[PDB]
Amino acid sequence: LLRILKETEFKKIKVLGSGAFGTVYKGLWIPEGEKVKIPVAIKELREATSPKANKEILDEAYVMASVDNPGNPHVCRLLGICLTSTVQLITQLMPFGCLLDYVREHKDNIGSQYLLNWCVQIAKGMNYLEDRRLVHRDLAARNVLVKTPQHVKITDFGLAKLLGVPIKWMALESILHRIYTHQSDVWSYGVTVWELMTFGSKPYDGIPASEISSILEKGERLPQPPICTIDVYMIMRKCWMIDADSRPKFRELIIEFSKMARDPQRYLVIQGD
Numbered sequence: 426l427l428r429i430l431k432e433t434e435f436k437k438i439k440v441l442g443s444g445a446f447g448t449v450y451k452g453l454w455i456p457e458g459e460k461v462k463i464p465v466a467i468k469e470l471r472e473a474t475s476p477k478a479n480k481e482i483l484d485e486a487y488v489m490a491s492v493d494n495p496g497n498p499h500v501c502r503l504l505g506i507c508l509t510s511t512v513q514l515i516t517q518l519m520p521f522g523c524l525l526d527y528v529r530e531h532k533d534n535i536g537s538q539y540l541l542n543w544c545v546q547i548a549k550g551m552n553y554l555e556d557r558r559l560v561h562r563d564l565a566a567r568n569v570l571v572k573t574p575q576h577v578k579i580t581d582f583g584l585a586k587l588l589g590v591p592i593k594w595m596a597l598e599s600i601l602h603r604i605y606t607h608q609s610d611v612w613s614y615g616v617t618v619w620e621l622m623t624f625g626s627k628p629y630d631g632i633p634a635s636e637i638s639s640i641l642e643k644g645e646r647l648p649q650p651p652i653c654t655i656d657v658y659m660i661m662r663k664c665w666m667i668d669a670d671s672r673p674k675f676r677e678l679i680i681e682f683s684k685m686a687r688d689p690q691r692y693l694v695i696q697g698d
């Protein structure tokens with residue numbers, strides 16, 4: 426179910442960019458009983474980052490591979506793992522990067538059907554992890570990769586559990602008492618949708634991370650995006666509720682956004698449709 430990878434099976438050729446708690450590389454894969462050299466994406470995680478031993482990390486990474494079966498078209502399967510001095514994670518090399526970059530670079534050229542479709546896709550993958558009882562703990566436009574412009578897939582799930590902080594994305598219970606539930610991921614989904622609807626703007630721009638906790642208590646939220654009708658922004662605002670059970674469910678989000686995709690011009694006001 427989970428491929429254990431020898432150091433000679435792969436080699437991190439180029440670097441894609443550095444992460445907050447590690448570095449992301451572009452590499453190759455010459456498997457055990459295979460002679461081809463498959464291009465892969467390798468995630469080297471910094472040493473002593475995870476407060477677990479390699480055998481504890483291994484057994485926990487076995488369930489993040491159980492997710493890969495029966496699978497989901499909007500969930501990133503992990504190809505293999507390298508548990509040596511550091512934790513290295515192999516996945517397919519997606520040449521079109523994250524949706525955070527896609528919306529920032531394509532801002533003008535992006536349509537309304539696209540954003541609502543992406544919002545259904547992100548909720549479709551998150552509902553799958555809810556049903557397979559995995560809690561992402563870090564969902565944002567950065568951890569959602571563009572396979573093709575109409576196919577986004579969520580990556581970096583369970584990684585936060587694997588180690589031991591995105592303040593501007595966490596639900597208030599996660600910030601205050603480190604409580605991560607399936608409903609805390611719905612707060613992140615709302616923030617993630619706010620990122621798409623604001624062409625990659627940084628949430629709470631200006632406000633320090635330390636401040637956010639009190640800002641959410643004063644009932645202040647991310648503003649209504651200049652394309653979002655009150656209808657859509659209300660879905661977003663509902664995700665950011667204080668009582669976690671009161672926030673929408675991922676089944677309900679798929680449903681509400683699927684309805685909006687039928688007539689995207691009614692729910693999103695972009696110049697070009």
Ligand SMILES: *CCC(=O)N1Cc2nc(-c3cccc(C#Cc4ncccn4)c3)n(-c3ccncc3)c2C1
Nearest residue numbers: 449466467468501503516518519522523567581582
């Ligand atoms: C758009 C740039 C950005 O912010 N990105 C964040 C990011 N991370 C990764 C990535 C690299 C290597 C491995 C993984 C993984 C995983 C995983 N963990 C648990 C369960 C399932 N999968 C994630 N990428 C990335 C870059 C290029 N190709 C693929 C992924 C990005 C992009």
